Every structure is written in structure tokens, then in C-alpha cells.
Amino acid sequence: AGFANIQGRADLSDVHLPDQVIKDVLQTAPEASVLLNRARKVRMSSKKTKQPVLA
Amino acid sequence: AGFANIQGRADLSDVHLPDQVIKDVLQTAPEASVLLNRARKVRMSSKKTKQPVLA
């Protein structure tokens, strides 16, 4: 054997030296859109809308 | 003999002419650390911590 022997990290399986886990995801919140909040909103009831204009 | 004699400082022992002692040590009080107060604080239970991230 000799004198150099010491217990190391690599002598144990990962089950006995587990990483601590933080359960929640590190993320920033989903950002809201510009046009769907600034623009005037109308319900469409057809694929196309028509309006007359003075020209 | 003579007229020249007078009692000097050097004619007494240091026991009888003591310096006054102020017992309290002159010092400024210990400062606080920056990161141990400013950062967010968590208790670790293993050499490593692992967290999931949106990527």
C-alpha cells in the first residue's frame, strides 16, 4: 500500500455525492406585443372588409 | 555637603513615578463585507448546485 492513499471525490458514486437541484427554471417572462396593444381593435366577420373614402 | 543638592526625577524608582495607563485599546470598529450583505443568500447542501434554464 504505502503512505500516499487518501479518499477522493472520484471514489464515491454520484448517488452519494449528488448535486443540489433548484426546481424552478431560470427564465425572463414572455414579452407582450406592440400592435395588439397600441392599435385600434375591430372584430372581423369575413376574410375581407371594405370602406368608402373621399378621394 | 554644599548648597547644590535637590531631589530630581532620576532619584526615584519607576514604581513611584508610574505612567497612568488607559486600559481600552485604541482602534476603529470592524467593517462589513459587500457581497455577504448586498447579494441574495442561499444555503448549499452539496459542493455543487444545478439549475435548469430556458435556452
Automatic annotation (TrEMBL), chains A, B:
Query: This chain belongs to which protein, by name?
Result: Capsid protein
Q: From what organism does this protein derive?
A: Mycobacterium phage Muddy
Please state which portion of the whole protein this structure contains, as first and last residue out of the total length: 2 to 56 of 329
Where, subcellularly, is it found? Virion
